[PDB]
Every structure is written in C-alpha cells, then in structure tokens.
From a paper:
Examining the SPNS2-DDM structure, we hypothesize the C-domain’s narrow acyl-chain binding pocket would sterically exclude larger detergents and therefore purified the protein in the larger diacyl detergent LMNG. NbD12-bound SPNS2 was monodisperse in LMNG, and we determined the complex’s structure in this detergent to a resolution of 3.7 Å by cryo-EM. Building and refining the SPNS2-NbD12 structure in LMNG, the proteins are generally unchanged from the DDM condition (all-atom RMSD = 0.47 Å). Notably, however, there is no apparent non-protein density in the central cavity or pocket of the SPNS2 map determined in LMNG. Further, the difference between the observed Coulombic potential map and the predicted density from the protein-only SPNS2-NbD12 model gave a large positive density for the structure determined in DDM but not LMNG. This supports our assignment of the ambiguous density in the SPNS2-DDM map as n-dodecyl-β-D-maltopyranoside and indicates our LMNG map has captured the transporter’s inward-facing apo (Ci-apo) state. The most pronounced structural change in SPNS2 between apo and DDM-bound states is a ~ 90° rotation in Trp440, with its side chain rotating roughly parallel to the plane of the membrane in the absence of a head group for hydrogen bonding. Further, while the density of Glu433’s terminal carboxylate is weak, as is expected for this anionic moiety, this side chain rotates in the presence of DDM to accommodate the acyl chain and appears positioned to form a hydrogen bond with Thr373. Comparing our inward-facing apo SPNS2 and the published outward-facing apo structures, the transporter has undergone a rigid body conformational change consistent with the classic MFS rocker-switch mechanism.
Of these, SPNS2 is the primary exporter of S1P into lymph.
Author numbering:
A (entry chain B): 1 to 126
B (entry chain A): 100 to 288, 297 to 350, 360 to 539
The structure:
Amino acid sequence: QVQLVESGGGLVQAGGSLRLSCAASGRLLSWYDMAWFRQAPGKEREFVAAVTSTGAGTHYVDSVKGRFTISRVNAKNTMYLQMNSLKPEDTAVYYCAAANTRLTALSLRTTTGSWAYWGKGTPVTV
Amino acid sequence: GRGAAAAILSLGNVLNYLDRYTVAGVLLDIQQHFGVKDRGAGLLQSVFICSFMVAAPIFGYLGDRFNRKVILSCGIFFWSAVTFSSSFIPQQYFWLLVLSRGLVGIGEASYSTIAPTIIGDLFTKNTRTLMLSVFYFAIPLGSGLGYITGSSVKQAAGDWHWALRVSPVLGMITGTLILILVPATKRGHKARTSWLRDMKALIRNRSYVFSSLATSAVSFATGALGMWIPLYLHRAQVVQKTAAKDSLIFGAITCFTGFLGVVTGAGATRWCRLKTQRADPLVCAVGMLGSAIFICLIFVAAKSSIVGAYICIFVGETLLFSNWAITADILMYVVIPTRRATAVALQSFTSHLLGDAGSPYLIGFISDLIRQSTKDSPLWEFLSLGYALMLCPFVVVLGGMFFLATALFFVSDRARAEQQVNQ
C-alpha cells in the first residue's frame, strides 16, 4: 500500500521550465521503480520517463532525451522531474506511477499496465 | 491430475534427506562397531558433501541431454542399492563404507539437482510457488524423520545394521512410482566462455562474495551441528550420574526448529523492510549473532542440565535456519538475471566447499587432537568434543560479520546492477 501525490503541475508559458514532485508516504520509496506517464486528450496513456530504485538507471523517449530530467531522493522519499523548453504538444495530464522493483530492462517496460500503482495526476499546460 | 508427480517427488525428497541423515543418528553405533576415532566419523560426512558438490553441476548439465525422469530414477535406484550394500559391509573394512557414502552423495546430488527443475516445468503459476514451497519444506521434516527412524530402528531391532536396511526398500517403492507417475516434458533451451565472463563479473562484485562467505559459514555450522550434536548429548548424559532417546529428541527439534526458523525469518523480513532497505542482511546478521550466543550458552550449561541444552539447541537452530529463506532473496537482489543461474551454481559450490564439506572432519580432527593429549575417559572425551564444537560460534559470528558487510555493500551493488541492466 503506497499512496502517490503529485504537485507542482499547472499551466505555464511556452519555453519555460517547470518542476513536478511525486511524494509517497504509504511505504518506503526505496523498494519501487517509478515512472511518469501522460494522458493526451486525443490519445491514451503514453510513457515519458522512468527511474530505477537507486536512480542509477534512466530511460527516456526519442522526443524526451535532452529535454527532460528525472531523479529521486529516498531520504526525503520524493521523486522530482524537471521539464525545460516545453513544446506546445506537452499540454496533458501527468500521472506518477510506481512498481515493485525488478532487475529488468527499464526501456522494455513501457506498457502502461505493468505499473500496478498510480497517483492522482496533475494537469500541465504549455 | 499432475499433482501425483509432485507428491511422489516430495516423498522422494523426504526419503532422500532421511537417507542422508540416517548415519547421523547411529554415528555412535558405527564408531563403536568399527573401532574408529572421530576422524572417520567426520570423514563420512565430508566425503558425502564433497561428492554431492562435485556431482550436482554435472547432473544439472546432464539434465538437458536426456530425459530427466529416467536419470532421476536411475540415481534413486543407485543410491538405494549402494546403501543396501553398505548395510552388509564387513567390520574390518572401513573405506568401503566411505565409498558407499560417496556414491550415495552422487545419487542424492543427481536427485536434488534434477527434481526441482521437473517440478518447475510442471507448474507455471502461483501453484508452482506453492509446490516448490512444499518440496522445500520437505527438507527439515525429512531430516527429523531420518533421525527418528535411525533411533527407532536401532532401538527396536537391537542392531544398527537394520538402520541402513529399512530406508533403501522404500526407495525402490519410490523409484518405480517415479518411473510411472512422472510425466515427460518436451522442453529445451558458448558455455565455457559464458562461465568465464560470469565468474569475472561476479568476482568484481562485493556484496555477492560476502553473502557467499556468510552462507558458507552457515553451512559449516549446520553441518557440524547436525553431525555431532546427538553424539555430544549422549556423551554428556554418560557424564551425568543418571544412566536412542537423544536422536529422537534431536530429530523432532530439528524439524520443529527448521519450520519455525523459516516462518520467523519470513515474518521478521516482512515486518522489518519498512524501517530500511537493508532489512534482508540485517535480519540474517541478527539471527546469526543470536544463534552464536545460544550455541555458546548450551556448551556453558550442558554439564548442568540436559533440558537447558535442549532449549538452547532449539533456539540456536531456529535462529540459524532463519537465514535459509532470506539468502535467496539477498542473492536475487544483487546479481542480474542473466548471470543469476550461474551465480547460484557458484554459490552452491562455494557454500559446500569452504563450509559443509570441511566442517565434520575438522571437528573430528580437533576432538581427536585434544583427546590424544589427555588420558582417555568419558569425561575427558566429552570435554574434548565440547571444545571442538566450541569452534562453531566463532564461525557463526564470522558469518554475522559477513552479513553486516553485505548490508554495507547492498545499496552500492544494487545500483551497479541497475546501471548495468539498463546499459
């Protein structure tokens, strides 16, 4: 039982920078591999980025590398995502998801169904 | 119904551990009959473990060559026949029994390496986990059954030879059933280069080596205790003024303590992971320290009462066996899946090499060296065996320190594994 709360998301001007914080309090965060997804208005859930348990492994999308940063802190039990140079196609609702840690390829785990734990989700507008 | 195969394999594994630990209950009778010191007593178990460790990878590789049911049944028949023949060994010959124990170890290694793969192939679900849990819970029950069966047969028959005669017959009754009630599965999948690469990657790893050393220390302690405790208790009773019971008591205690230790280790891990991410090695280290304390305590209070010795044995064996259900989780959290299987094999070698193999003969040699320096007497031989078994808490504390080092390197090696997997 882990509860995920998203914060820092909202409408921002184009070309700016934004920080999104996902906080967990149900259990210890060191046991969960986390990720971010977005629900486009005209599409289904789409993978954005993911961070392993210790933060040593990061995977992004072809349109995400070099534009987004994602990391976590287990001392404060919170993950953070920094978005820079936002495109107009980034206006969507973002969900923070966590899954039981596994030593699998993080890139191959982008099925938006393997993450059994989700959050409330916050809308971000560019 | 495919559950018949699982049930018969579980019964076969119970009989396997019974045949493995039958000699433990009648070690005193064997020593009295053959007129030998503790060196041969330790050497029997040492040779058994050495043959087991040498043969297990070979049979694991051979399991992918031909059908596993046939080789499993052949190994069961081989070890049953070898035990039955060893039951009729002349007194003046001792090396023949050692060779028989080696052959039995070869057969047991074949069975223990082949059967779990068959069970895993039969079931692909949570039912697979349940069946494997039953098959592995068969271990402490099998050891207790072996101890109590040896004691009961020695008492009732009046001669220890029938102790080696009752078990093999059932094995035949098992083997034929395995030849009949085990379905055949049509499954399949650079080897030396892969082994070299995996070994090179694993040597550079840090927590894996310390965990392997810790489980080697655990195997050392378990082998030494399971080989020498009933004889030590019998000697202690001889020391006391008050005039088979010890073997039955130790078998029941072994079964109950194995089950209780697995349960309490699982519970402690479940209720301690919330505190920190390093719960898996910390629980093992705490259990090892407690087991070492109680193993010292029994030898401290052995001369006073036997009830206290039984209680301390109970607590120490529970704490010592608490790590069996957590070592696997420690291993799978550090080694990447691609190199996991090889890693297990290496561990299944190392834990047997530095641990269980040398422990019985080392204890016997230390006891004999101490006893030779003094006039032979029941009190002096009891004291010598107590001093020899006093080496066990040292190894248990060393294993606890190794578990602490594993806890120290746990997160760093986990991060290295993550970054290697994502690479």
